[PDB]
């Protein structure tokens, strides 16, 4: 009764002398994550997530070796559990981008990150370690129709059906390492020491080999089109066929949220997600 007390044997080993009741537990979908001052401990809730935990550690070790221009959670220990280093710094509010030199600097750092992700996609240690699913967008569309259309109005279903149609048109690219959920909260910064400096990136649960348009769409979602355009132009990705891929994938974000909220039993996320479609 209380995850901390329940796992106290392991925590005394992994964090000797650390009071368990002083820690913190984020409650994930697959994992309970115990937060310590410089590291976290991933405990698999289900026996599905415990079966994949060895795979996940291999992925994190691949990420930790890559040149991304920043930090990633490094596997410190695995045994079942995975201990990861905590990336320092905090998310940057969209507010800070109003200062144009700050915007310039942050855009530049995003470019380095995406470049390194793109470059890493050509590797083999990466390609053979990381998920690389076929037609993930077709499977997604099948899931939306099955699980979400019944929650939707006729106009909603029509609008969503256009969005899923657009997905068929996407090339099934596996060029780059794709974070998969590269929102503002997942990118951490050092602030109050001159202009913001990228510390690192977290929440790699969705990481795969795929299309970087996905990471770009996420940035645009978190910070708006102006800032995304600044990144697109700095990185030389402001072409038409990229823009199309971005827009198509960006339009699945509310539906992705709903689909996961549907499976979660998280009704607030489901309502928020379905706001357009009913």
């Amino acid at each position: 009764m209380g995850i901390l007390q329940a796992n106290r044997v392991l925590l005394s080993r992994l964090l000797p002398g650390v009071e368990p009741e002083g820690l913190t537990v984020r409650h994930g979908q697959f994992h309970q994550v115990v937060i310590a001052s410089d590291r976290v401990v991933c405990l698999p809730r289900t026996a599905a997530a415990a079966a994949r935990l060895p795979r996940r550690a291999a992925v994190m070790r691949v990420l930790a070796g890559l040149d991304l221009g920043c930090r990633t959670p490094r596997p410190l220990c695995e045994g079942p559990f995975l201990v990861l280093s905590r990336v320092p710094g905090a998310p940057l509010e969209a507010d800070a981008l109003e200062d144009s030199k700050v915007a310039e600097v942050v855009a530049a750092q995003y470019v380095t990150l995406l470049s390194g992700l793109a470059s890493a996609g050509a590797d083999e240690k990466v390609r053979a370690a990381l998920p690389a699913p076929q037609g993930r967008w077709r499977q997604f569309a099948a899931d939306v129709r099955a699980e979400l259309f019944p929650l939707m109005s006729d106009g909603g279903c029509r609008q969503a059906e256009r969005e899923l149609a657009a997905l068929d048109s996407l090339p099934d690219i596996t060029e780059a390492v794709v974070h998969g959920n590269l929102g503002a909260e997942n990118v951490l910064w050092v602030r109050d020491d001159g202009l913001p400096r990228l510390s690192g990136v977290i929440d790699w649960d969705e990481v795969s080999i795929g299309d970087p348009a996905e990471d770009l769409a996420a940035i645009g979602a978190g910070y708006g089109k102006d800032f995304l355009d600044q990144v697109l132009t700095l990185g030389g990705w402001s072409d038409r066929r990229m823009a199309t891929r971005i827009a198509t994938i960006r339009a699945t974000f509310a539906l992705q949220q709903a689909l996961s909220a549907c499976r979660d039993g998280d009704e607030e996320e489901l309502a928020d997600g379905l706001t357009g479609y009913r």
Partner: peptide
């Protein structure tokens, strides 16, 4: 999760 993708 949340519009970014969670």
């Amino acid at each position: 999760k949340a519009x970014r993708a969670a």
